Design a binder for this molecule. Sequence first.
Ligand SMILES: Nc1ncnc2c1ncn2[C@@H]1O[C@H](COP(=O)(O)OP(=O)(O)O)[C@@H](O)[C@H]1O
Ligand SMILES: [Mg+2]
Length: 787
Amino acid sequence: KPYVLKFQEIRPHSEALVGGKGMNLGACSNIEGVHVPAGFCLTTEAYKRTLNEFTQLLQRLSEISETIRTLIQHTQIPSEIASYMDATLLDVGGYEMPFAVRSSAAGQHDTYLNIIGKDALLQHISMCWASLFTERAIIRKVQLAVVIQQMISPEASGILFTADPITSNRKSLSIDASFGLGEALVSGLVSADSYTVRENTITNKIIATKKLAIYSLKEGGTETRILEKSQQTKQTLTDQQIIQLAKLGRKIEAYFGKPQDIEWCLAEGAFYIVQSRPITTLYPIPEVNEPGNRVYISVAHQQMMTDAMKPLGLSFYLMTTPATMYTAGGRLFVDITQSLSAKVSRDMMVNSLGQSDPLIKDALLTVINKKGFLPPLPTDSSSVFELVRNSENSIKHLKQSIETKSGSDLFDFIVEDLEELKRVLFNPTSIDAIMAGMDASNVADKLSESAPNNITSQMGLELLDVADVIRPYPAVRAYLEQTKNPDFMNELATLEGGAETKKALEDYLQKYGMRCAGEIDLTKTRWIENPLTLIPLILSNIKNFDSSASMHKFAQGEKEAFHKEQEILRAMETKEKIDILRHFIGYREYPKYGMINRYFIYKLALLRAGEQLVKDGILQEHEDIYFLYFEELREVVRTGQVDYELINARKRDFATFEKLTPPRILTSDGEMINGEYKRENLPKDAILGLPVSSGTVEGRARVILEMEKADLEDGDILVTAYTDPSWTPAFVSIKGLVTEVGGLMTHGAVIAREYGLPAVVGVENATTIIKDGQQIRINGTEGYIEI
Ligand SMILES: Nc1ncnc2c1ncn2[C@@H]1O[C@H](COP(=O)(O)OP(=O)(O)O)[C@@H](O)[C@H]1O
Ligand SMILES: [Mg+2]
């Protein structure tokens, strides 16, 4: 409550009084052995008493802020606030000395360098209040504060990262060094060098053509020019100055406990710190107990599912998998350090996951040959139909036994049923079945086209079946395209056709509504929980199709399958080898279908177990159970208590985890190791990936993440992060496929070869580089855009 706060007198955690930037300076001030330019902060309550008229306008949209901005400029600061300003300013050099006017709120406001005089500073303080109402700051009522510290006139300045911004390696240190002052509004006109330090050794130096530099002229800041070889020839910092700055950086990192973003200035051989912020863009570290250097591999990349998962979702995958895993950033990992400490164990993993995709193999070889990260090495055909029915009989008994149970023994029941889930999924008979399919295997693929009893194939095909019973009744499309409303399946009967489509739509939801995009995450909304997700894909099947499209495109397959059956005819060992393949491989996607069925049954049982948690007065909202791990959730039910400061923490963490993309290889130092494609005799421009389906075509790119933005017309090419079996019904309206992750024999990869759809997977950052709308080119090998 003091009007003016000096840096070394700032109270921990009261940001609201001083602001983030000021609290940072108030923290770096107490760091022994670190020089922070003396100064103080104008209390946010000085911004408040400087204000009856001002409220005239904060009600008016509780672009003419150019009157409310000039008001604060013309509104003069009270004599006492001005007096307190005079005292603390005189203690840090007084007037006749230069100071920096910096505002402290995320976002950005106005900061003014090198201001001298009482009148000039009073004006700039008011201009900083004005920065709150330029049409940028606009898109409530908050309190701003102003930092006033000694203006440094350095030879060099720049930024410092205690962790490599790209690789996220915490034992790496990046420095951006440039001559002259820093910029409040950074423009690409003051370039800088880039140094990289691991520990006391320089690992990388990038010198830049720095033609321009900002110098604090007697008052204000002119931008002079440097001599041609004062740019090139001169490192911004000497080899020792870089190391000195590095040590200076990790002394601040050790103080805050977190990797910091530090702004520095260099005057007369001495360094000064003007700002320090925690880095919030790093990929988190798996919480593991034994101390050595560790290498983790991404389960996400193995499962072709890179999206972040909620706690409860992570739990159910952990309980499903026998192998011990670890969680980091909403993704799961497997510690393979033990297998990379033995030569026999090393190779057997490299060539097992290697040719599957060179990115993993390259990433493995990357970590293996690192600078001593790792220790050196010291001197049956009738089998199908029952497995299907046994699965169906295993689901029916589960579903009518969960409605039986609730409370605490509900969790006792799920844990037990997970064991049954295991011996159905890991059933030797079930995996001996498709071993026969895969061992039955160029010539083999198209010979296996249009094989019945494939659960995901029917899902895509029956959607077309659904599409053609829907269609005559025109009367049912207008309502469909404005509906923001999830419960659209109620007003179908008030209209004609909608009743007869509902029956066809509900029958679909009975067999295929249990899936979704990323079924692996149990907490993710299924199709029957929100049928509004299938709207575009069904409309897309409506916008372009037949009376019985499911018949023909199915029909297409077996006749091209019916002219290859005997190119080879004109040797009867081969005839059923083809079938024991054909009549089987449709089952290769049923264990997946059987598992996620049990998922949804648990979910409904757990959700209603959460609905009783809101009526007991324990839960605020319904689906907050997603942010608790399984065992935590067991205890909340057994107790009647719960920490919501953890829940909200889980909520913001998950939101942070969504902006991240998991690495194929993650180290104990946080370093993200993805693979790299080997390329020459291939176009300069080309973005590289993995070949999946032979073919070359071009067309319009549709970068689509959710299956709700899936407005697919004819000549489009689908560009997404991953292709799930639930994504496969969309393969009827596209011409090409580009995914950030995929395999040579995922189901998407299979039906892409049957339809003749050229597809490329393993294309890193494909949903960021390829902007939606661009005409792109794709080839079975590599594929790049056409401007
Ligand atoms: N007291 C100071 N002396 C010299 N340079 C400074 C001082 N304060 C800030 N700067 C420089 O001004 C630049 C702009 O910082 P600032 O505008 O306060 O951060 P933000 O833009 O986040 O508000 C910084 O990069 C820093 O190098
Ligand atoms: Mg800054």
